[PDB]
Write an enzyme that holds these catalytic residues in place. Sequence first.
Site, short mmCIF file in Angstrom:
data_model
loop_
_atom_site.label_atom_id
_atom_site.label_comp_id
_atom_site.label_asym_id
_atom_site.label_seq_id
_atom_site.Cartn_x
_atom_site.Cartn_y
_atom_site.Cartn_z
N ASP B 25 0.86 -1.21 0.00
CA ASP B 25 0.00 0.00 0.00
C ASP B 25 0.88 1.24 0.00
O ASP B 25 1.38 1.73 1.08
CB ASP B 25 -0.89 -0.04 1.23
CG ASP B 25 -1.86 1.07 1.29
OD1 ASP B 25 -1.67 2.08 0.59
OD2 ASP B 25 -2.83 0.93 2.06
N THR B 26 1.10 1.78 -1.20
CA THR B 26 1.99 2.99 -1.31
C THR B 26 1.32 4.27 -0.82
O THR B 26 1.96 5.28 -0.76
CB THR B 26 2.51 3.25 -2.70
OG1 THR B 26 1.39 3.57 -3.56
CG2 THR B 26 3.22 1.97 -3.31
N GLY B 27 0.03 4.23 -0.48
CA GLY B 27 -0.61 5.36 0.19
C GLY B 27 -0.56 5.36 1.69
O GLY B 27 -1.07 6.30 2.36
#
Lengths: 99, 99
Positions: B25-27
């Site tokens: 999850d790059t957020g």
Amino acid sequence: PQITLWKRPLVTIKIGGQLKEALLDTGADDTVLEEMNLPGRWKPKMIGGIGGFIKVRQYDQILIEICGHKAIGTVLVGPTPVNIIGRNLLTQIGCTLNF
Amino acid sequence: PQITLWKRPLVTIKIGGQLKEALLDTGADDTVLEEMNLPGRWKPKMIGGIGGFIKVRQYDQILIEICGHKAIGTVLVGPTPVNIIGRNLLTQIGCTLNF
Ligand SMILES: [Mg+2]
């Protein structure tokens, strides 16, 4: 390009005339963008945030440019804290995770 | 490996003996994992979710394996809906976004 992840991966997007900063967010199914004027037809949608659920407007088949890469897809418009590029557009630009 | 984004990017991680499914999850700034026994010392932390803020336990310097790639980092443990690998570990495994 190739984006490392030491910092939030904020890129410039071009949408409906306008330059905006947005987050490349592989944990988001959908793309949600701060208040803006988009032309055509929309429907209302509910989506989650830290407060609870917010109502947003769904516009389908919208042209967005993301670091020089053009995509078409659904963009949700409403009172989101953060401009989020989700997977529905990341697939469109051919974005992968690599390690 | 190379991960396309048509589907949620759920990988197997190995942590504290155990196999678990988790989201790349790059957020997410931080890594948060469902209830589990981790050994050493912890502190409490508050973090956001759809309901409001949840209390989690912070364990620092934890060994995690993510698709065969070993990392050390902070893992938060608590009643999260989704096991999230955030950027604090994605940088550790050399994960980039590419398009
Ligand atoms: Mg998120």
